[PDB]
Design a protein around this ligand. Structure first.
Ligand code: HEM
Ligand code: HEM
Ligand code: 12S
Ligand code: 12S
Ligand code: CL
Ligand code: CL
Lengths: 361, 362
């Protein structure tokens, strides 16, 4: 059964992949090779070309992503050759450096060996490669609450944070055969951070807010033609609202809106003053300004929606069905000012794609 | 079959309704009466109590409505007795006056005779009882674009608008037996309007913006226990964002954000300045300020979401499943600042409820 399931997934993917690459004539022999490889071994190995286009197709099919216009320019790094935790560590370090690119962020994915028997070769515990720790000790909150459980797990393994509001979590991952994961402190030279200032309000720096440059999702599974790459971290650049309207603004995150209202000099007493809405706008203005000033890539939600509109048009021009998740595509501030808000999207799941998987802690 | 379909709907509704009213003992005899009535006449007639609670349940089941906390205080006006266009006209006039209540808006529904054979007794053409006209003639846009087709239909029947940006559409409805609808101009004394000013920026009044006080939805069908009340206008008070973030801000509506940016003194040149977002906040601040200043009921989206949270809790405290449409419940500005954004809702259809129906124009 499993071999047929794998075979059927491979047939679908190879046909689609090679057609898009203008190599439909090569399909027959490739499928013959794969057919024999599956018979002998129970699996098959992607070519570098198949792997690269597969990761790109997966981004293209990611319904929740507003940034998909640039799907075909994804930088795909093949590290299916790694076998040691040192090689994994250095590959992760390298991903951070090359994706950061001194501020001119490159959308990048690093692909580690796939599951074998449903057996993971490498198991990454981080949600993102760069992320702040979070703590809670007797009513006292420090750092990022979303990181509390991973932070506790790290400190169970001998790591200790300084308990600032912005402790960088270590890389943490487990190798096949090991009962426990290893962890490695991030070199600060690798991590670009951006202090948040406001273009017109000098007092904004009193908040001492900052955020990291590059969002590198490291806990999702890439599925390509029946092969499951459970370890394959990927990054783009931020959309401003992610930082200003969610990470720094959410009550269950850094919860900064009341303090923002204070430094921009407005009262936070009455709902009808819309002070939260005003504070959100100035905070998001500050984020965009600060990233731009430091020379770190970022996009505002209006520009991003415009780019996504072109992605929709491009899909139609290429004859491809468009899929999307309206609830994630609309930005968390002024959504109705985007075209996205005013149309609907088919939330069907198309493969190749990126999927959630169970957390190991 | 229809008598069977009707019977089954009535059975379901009467049972639920009477249980909520603490009158479960009366169900048996009531259904017996309904059974005989359906056999003789092909339909049945709601008691005033059933009708009132039915309309309230329908509001309670309205998935897209953030204002449902106050479902049980709905003011239900029974006008199943009307037979003439003069009676309909005066009932509609009366609804406007009593709902407006000199600014302290009362959530109200006026219920007209139901469909018989799927044959409408009264057919209201207005989307809302109070609404601005819209025009388009050789590249020139005037008024509210959403009203263009109804406006054109009205002018087909001998009405003519002044072609301001805020012409009040006439009441327009058709009586059973008439080929064409009749129309009646709204008395201005009945219609409260609110000039939009800003609390801190005196220049805002240069925009000469205004909006009407009361949103009175008049083109939806109320379904209660298999009975179809196709004509049953209902109103609440506005949530500020409806006016400031949609009606006045939408590009396909009054499209005022560029002009707002100008009077509040910010550049509208770069997306990264978030000038649209800033203009939206100040416009919505102005709307809330202006309604409050004039003494016309309004609610901000934060307060409304807080009230809706209590509605969720009340539903759980009772034995009721909730249901909701996430895409409509989230406000169009700062949605993530509300609890609504961070949870999900079952969008199942429960009856009694309010439903869309085909426009007789268009
Ligand atoms: C190039 C810059 C990019 C931008 C600006 C961008 C923008 C976004 C944003 C804003 C979200 C979250 C939407 C929300 O929270 O409502 C998102 C989700 C997502 N993006 Fe992108 N993205 C980018 C690149 C990428 C890349 C390179 C990939 C993978 C190859 C990717 C795959 C995804 C996926 C899988 C999700 C949803 C994850 C989940 O369901 O939890 N994006 N994107
Ligand atoms: C008391 C004040 C009320 C407020 C503040 C309120 C708020 C709202 C808002 C803001 C919407 C639109 C949501 C959006 O555009 O995304 C809405 C939709 C709706 N409301 Fe309410 N509402 C109120 C009273 C009522 C009443 C009295 C009824 C009927 C008995 C009602 C039934 C509905 C229905 C049916 C819709 C959906 C209309 C459609 O699908 O086109 N609401 N409500
Ligand atoms: C409450 C809520 C609502 C919503 N619409 N979206 C979110 C998700 C924010 C989010 C969450 C996850 C993981 C969810 C499961 N643990 C991942 C992301 C990725 C955002 C992202 C990814 C990438 C690759 C680039 C970029 N600019 N942004 C963004 C949360
Ligand atoms: C594009 C768009 C998105 C969205 N979420 N919601 C809308 C609808 C706004 C709207 C539309 C209709 C009619 C839709 C079908 N033509 C009706 C309403 C009712 C608003 C309302 C009703 C009532 C009763 C009270 C109140 N405060 N507000 C509000 C449009
Ligand atoms: Cl993030
Ligand atoms: Cl409206």
């Amino acid at each position: 059964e499993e071999k047929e399931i794998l075979w059927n997934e491979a047939k679908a993917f190879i046909a689609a992949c090679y057609q898009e690459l203008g190599k439909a004539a090569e399909v027959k022999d490739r499928l013959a090779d794969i057919k024999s490889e599956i018979d002998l071994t129970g699996s098959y190995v992607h070519t570098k070309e198949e792997l690269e286009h597969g990761a790109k197709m997966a981004w293209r099919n990611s319904n929740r992503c507003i940034g998909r216009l640039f799907w075909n320019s994804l930088n795909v790094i093949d590290r299916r050759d790694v076998r040691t935790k040192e090689e994994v560590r250095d590959a992760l370090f390298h991903h951070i450096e090359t994706a950061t690119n001194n501020g001119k962020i490159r959308p990048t994915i690093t692909i580690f060996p796939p599951e074998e028997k449903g057996e993971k070769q490498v198991e990454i515990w981080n949600h993102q490669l760069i992320r702040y720790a979070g703590y809670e000790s007797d009513g006292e909150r420090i750092g990022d609450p979303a990181s509390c459980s991973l932070t506790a797990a790290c400190e169970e393994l001998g790591w200790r944070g300084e308990r600032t509001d912005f402790d960088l979590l270590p890389l943490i991952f487990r190798m096949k055969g090991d009962e426990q994961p290893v962890w490695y402190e991030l070199p600060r030279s690798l991590v670009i951070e951006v202090p948040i200032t406001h273009p017109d309000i000098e007092a904004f720096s009193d908040l001492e807010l900052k955020w990291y440059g590059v969002p590198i999702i490291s806990d999702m599974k890439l599925e390509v033609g029946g092969i499951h790459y459970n370890a394959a971290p990927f990054n783009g650049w931020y959309m401003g609202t992610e930082i200003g309207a969610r990470n720094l603004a959410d009550e269950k995150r850094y919860d900064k809106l009341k303090k923002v209202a204070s430094v921009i000099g407005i009262a936070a007493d009455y709902n009808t003053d819309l002070w939260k809405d005003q504070a959100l706008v100035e905070l998001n203005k500050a984020v965009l300004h600060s990233y731009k000033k430091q020379g770190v890539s970022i996009v505002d939600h209006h520009t991003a929606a415009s780019q996504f509109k072109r992605f929709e048009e491009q899909a139609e021009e290429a004859g491809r069905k468009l899929t999307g998740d309206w609830t994630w595509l609309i930005p968390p501030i002024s959504p109705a000012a985007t075209h996205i808000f005013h149309r609907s999207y088919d939330n069907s799941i198309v493969k190749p794609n990126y999927f959630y998987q169970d957390k190991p802690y």
